[PDB]
């Protein structure tokens, strides 16, 4: 679950995935058209009363 | 009788000494080949080898010999 944004990451031609420091997926390659998309979680935050 | 018939570009795309580097290894019945074509005794510095080539054979290797022509 997240929001997809066009990426300026320079993927190597053999690389189709991108990992974070915590080893979750950060960027993914679209299988149909060869373009790179960033993955960012949707907006969140804490609520105080 | 051949099983693997990949069609490739020539490995000497560079026309400088065009030092080729290769890494072959055998892991659990799967052959892995790595390659690099950096241009330059072995020099200093780093040049990571890309896994873009893959020509598996997968039986057993304990001896090898470079073919020449």
């Amino acid at each position: 679950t997240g929001v997809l944004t066009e990426s300026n990451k320079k993927f190597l031609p053999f690389q189709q995935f991108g990992r974070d420091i915590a080893d979750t997926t950060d960027a993914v390659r679209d299988p149909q058209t060869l373009e790179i998309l960033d993955i960012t979680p949707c907006s969140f935050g804490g609520v105080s009363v | 009788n051949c099983t693997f018939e990949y069609v490739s570009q020539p490995f000497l795309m560079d026309l400088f000494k065009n030092l080729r580097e290769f890494v072959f290894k055998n892991i659990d019945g799967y052959f892995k080949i790595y390659s690099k074509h950096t241009p330059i005794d072995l020099p200093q510095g780093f040049s990571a080898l890309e896994p873009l080539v893959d020509l598996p054979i997968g039986i057993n290797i304990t001896r090898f010999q470079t073919l020449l022509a």
Binding site: - | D28, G29, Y30, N60
Partner: protein, 49 residues
């Protein structure tokens, strides 16, 4: 029609196939292709009834 191997000089790596049928040597006496008292055939047939 179905065969299996009984004797081998060592164990097998994962996903490895053996086709060559050489006469097994279980002792200090050489075989040289002769099925002697210490030389056995490596392939025995399944008995299916």
């Amino acid at each position: 029609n179905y065969l299996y191997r009984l004797f081998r000089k060592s164990k097998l790596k994962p996903f490895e196939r053996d086709i060559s049928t050489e006469i097994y040597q279980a002792g200090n006496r050489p075989c040289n292709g002769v099925a002697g008292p210490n030389c056995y055939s490596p392939l025995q047939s399944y008995g299916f009834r």
